[PDB]
């Protein structure tokens, strides 16, 4: 409304990434949460 139609109020920033099929080594805790993950394709180590 008048201040001394309104659109795009505020500022919005979002990050977009695209999933690619990869082999991931997954570390499983007793809880079952994946504490550590590794991508073989990314590096020789």
């Amino acid at each position, epitope marked *: *409304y*008048l201040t*001394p*139609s309104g659109w795009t109020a505020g500022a919005a920033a979002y990050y977009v990434g695209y999933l690619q099929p990869r082999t991931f080594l997954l570390k499983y805790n007793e809880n079952g949460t994946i504490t550590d993950a590794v991508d073989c394709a990314l590096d020789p180590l």
Partner: antibody
Framework: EVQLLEQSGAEVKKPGASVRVSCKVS????????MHWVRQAPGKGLEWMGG????????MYAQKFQGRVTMTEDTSTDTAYMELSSLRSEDTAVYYC??????????????WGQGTLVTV | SVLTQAPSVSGAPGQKVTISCSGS????????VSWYQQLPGTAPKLLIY???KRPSGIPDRFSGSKSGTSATLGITGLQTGDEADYYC???????????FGGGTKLTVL
């Protein structure tokens, strides 16, 4: 921002009648903003009328004119009907459709319907 | 109506002269004031709201003040097209409604 449609276009009612006033909007939707009404007699001044109350959420009615004029609202079609009844001598005059924020702290009439003269 | 403003006032073009409206504590005292302009047979235009705020499209020349129950509408840089009536208004809790003065029709001499 917003342009306002005519308060009731052109209406003529001879004595022994009564007339609704349907004020629509554009660029907003009806129940995001409150309407208002003012009597304006040619060669004369302003007399406020109808109106919505930001406080208490009621649609106000001017006490002096209370009970003679009523208001209804159709939210989707943006049609707000102002029905004045029981025609009298001095009550034929231009009527202005006004809009103020319902957020409160808004007395100024903001956009206008351009006014419509009635007939008694 | 319930407020105080003269029917008409006149001044020479390009000059600086204002118009005031005398209310009460029951109306102007605790409430914000607005001002309106209408040309003959036209749409009354909001001039200043709150006595320090300009609507979109208003020349900055216009200003305003509220001293007690008295509210002046700052009018400067008179133009040949500035002749019209200006209306004071403020919220009323007395009748719990909207009130106005009779209106003051300016004349640019």
């Amino acid at each position: 921002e917003v342009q306002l449609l005519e308060q009731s276009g052109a209406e003529v009612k001879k004595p022994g009648a009564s007339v609704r006033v349907s004020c629509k909007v554009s660029g907003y939707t009806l129940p995001e903003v409150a309407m208002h009404w003012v009597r304006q007699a040619p060669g004369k001044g302003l007399e406020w009328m109808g109106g919505f109350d930001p406080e208490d959420g009621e649609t106000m009615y001017a006490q002096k004119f209370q009970g003679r004029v009523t208001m209804t609202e159709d939210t989707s079609t943006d049609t707000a009907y102002m029905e004045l009844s029981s025609l009298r001598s001095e009550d034929t005059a231009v009527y202005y459709c006004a809009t103020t924020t319902p957020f409160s702290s808004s007395y100024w009439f903001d956009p206008w319907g351009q006014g419509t003269l009635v007939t008694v | 109506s319930v407020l105080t403003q003269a029917p008409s006032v006149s001044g020479a073009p390009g000059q600086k002269v204002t118009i005031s409206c005398s209310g009460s504590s029951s109306n102007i005292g605790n409430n914000y004031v607005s001002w309106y302009q209408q040309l003959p047979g036209t749409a009354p235009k909001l001039l200043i709201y709150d006595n320090n705020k300009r609507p979109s499209g208003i020349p900055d020349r216009f200003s305003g003040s509220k001293s007690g129950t008295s509210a002046t509408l700052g009018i400067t840089g008179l133009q040949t097209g500035d002749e019209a009536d200006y209306y004071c208004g403020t919220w009323d809790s007395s009748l719990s409604a909207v009130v106005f003065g009779g209106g003051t029709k300016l004349t640019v001499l």
